[PDB]
Amino acid sequence: RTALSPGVLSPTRPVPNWIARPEYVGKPAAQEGSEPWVQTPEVIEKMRVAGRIAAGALAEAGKAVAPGVTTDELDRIAHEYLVDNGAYPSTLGYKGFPKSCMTSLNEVICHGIPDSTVITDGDIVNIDVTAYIGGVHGDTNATFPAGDVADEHRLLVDRTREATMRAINTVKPGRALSVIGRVIESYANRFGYNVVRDFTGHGIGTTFHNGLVVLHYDQPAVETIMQPGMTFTIEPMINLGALDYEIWDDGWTVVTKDRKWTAQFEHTLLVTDTGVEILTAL
Ligand code: MET
Ligand SMILES: [Co+2]
Ligand SMILES: [Co+2]
Ligand code: NA
C-alpha cells in the first residue's frame, strides 16, 4: 500500500437553489472569527437539527467505506444525504474548497479532497461532514476501517475515538477549556502516539469557525472557562509518526512527512447548565 497521490476531481455537485448558502460561498474568505461563543437558545435548538443531519450524512457515507470505492463516491453519498434533508454542505465553496466533505486516507492528516482515489483493503478513511441549515452549522467526523485493517491501525482508530469521548466527558461549565487537550494528549501519550498541534477544534454556531480555538494538547496557559451555551468541536488528529507534515499543491490535503498513518474523530458539543450534550450524536 503505497503513499497516496491525487486523483481526478469530479465536477462541482449541484445544490438546489432553494437551499440557503452560507454567506461565504463563492468568496475567497468567510465572515467569521468574532461571533459570540455562547449561543442563544434559538441557535442551540437549530444546532441540534444541523448536528443530527451532519451525523446522518457521516453515517451514510461511512457505510459505503469498502475496498473498491472512491473518495468521490463517499462525497456523492454525503452530499445527497445533506441535500435530501435541506442542508447545505458547509465545506462546498468554503475558501474555495471544491467538495461537500473531506475524505482523509491513511497518511492524510485532514482536509483531503474527495476524488477518483480508490480505497483498498486495509485502509483507514476519515470522512468529515458539515451541515448548514437554519442559519447554523453542525460538524462531525469519524475514521472508518476498509476491509482487513492491521492491528496497529485498528488500535490507533479505537484509541483516537476513545481520546475524543474522554475529552467530551470532561466538558462542564466552570471547567477550564484546557482540560480537553490535557486529557487527549495524556491518553495519546500512553500508547506513544503524538497529537497534532497545528490543527485544532473550534467554536461553531452561525459561523463555521467562529474564533474560539480548542487545543487538543496540553496547554495550560489558555485561561478560557467553559460556560453554559458555549458550542465547539473536539476533533483530535492523532499520529503514529512524527508531527511534521506537508500540504499538497491542491492547497488543502495535509500529509505526514514520514507517511505513517493518522486518525481523527469529531463531534460538535454543547456546554449545558451542568455538563455536555453531543449535538452530532447519531
Ligand atoms: C479548514 S476547513 C475544515 C472543515 C472541517 N469540517 C472542520 O471540522 O473544521
Ligand atoms: Co469537521
Ligand atoms: Co470541525
Ligand atoms: Na489519516
Side-chain angles (χ1 to χ4, degrees), residues 128 130 139-141 235 266:
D128 188 347
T130 308
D139 180 12
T140 188
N141 83 49
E235 62 178 274
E266 171 173 36

Side-chain angles (χ1 to χ4, degrees), residues 146-229:
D148 183 32
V149 176
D151 283 331
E152 186 183 8
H153 296 136
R154 291 182 182 285
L155 283 166
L156 175 64
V157 173
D158 283 345
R159 286 163 178 173
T160 302
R161 184 190 301 104
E162 179 72 6
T164 304
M165 294 319 278
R166 288 186 185 202
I168 294 165
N169 270 64
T170 74
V171 173
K172 77 184 297 209
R175 193 161 280 159
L177 192 65
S178 70
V179 297
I180 290 161
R182 191 166 83 233
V183 164
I184 291 166
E185 183 161 53
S186 293
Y187 196 68
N189 289 353
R190 177 184 296 192
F191 298 107
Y193 310 149
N194 302 308
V195 183
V196 165
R197 299 166 76 87
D198 283 0
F199 298 96
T200 70
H202 52 99
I204 181 166
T206 65
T207 57
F208 193 168
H209 302 94
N210 74 13
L212 172 62
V213 172
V214 185
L215 298 182
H216 294 132
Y217 58 93
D218 178 35
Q219 173 49 281
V222 174
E223 293 182 13
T224 305
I225 309 298
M226 291 182 262
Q227 296 177 69

Side-chain angles (χ1 to χ4, degrees), residues 104-109 124 261-263:
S104 298
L105 275 162
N106 304 347
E107 74 280 13
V108 177
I109 304 184
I124 67 177
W261 299 11
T262 156

Side-chain angles (χ1 to χ4, degrees), residues 113-141:
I113 303 183
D115 70 2
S116 62
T117 299
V118 186
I119 293 160
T120 338
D121 234 278
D123 293 337
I124 67 177
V125 181
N126 182 277
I127 300 170
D128 188 347
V129 198
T130 308
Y132 181 73
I133 183 171
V136 303
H137 303 261
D139 180 12
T140 188
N141 83 49

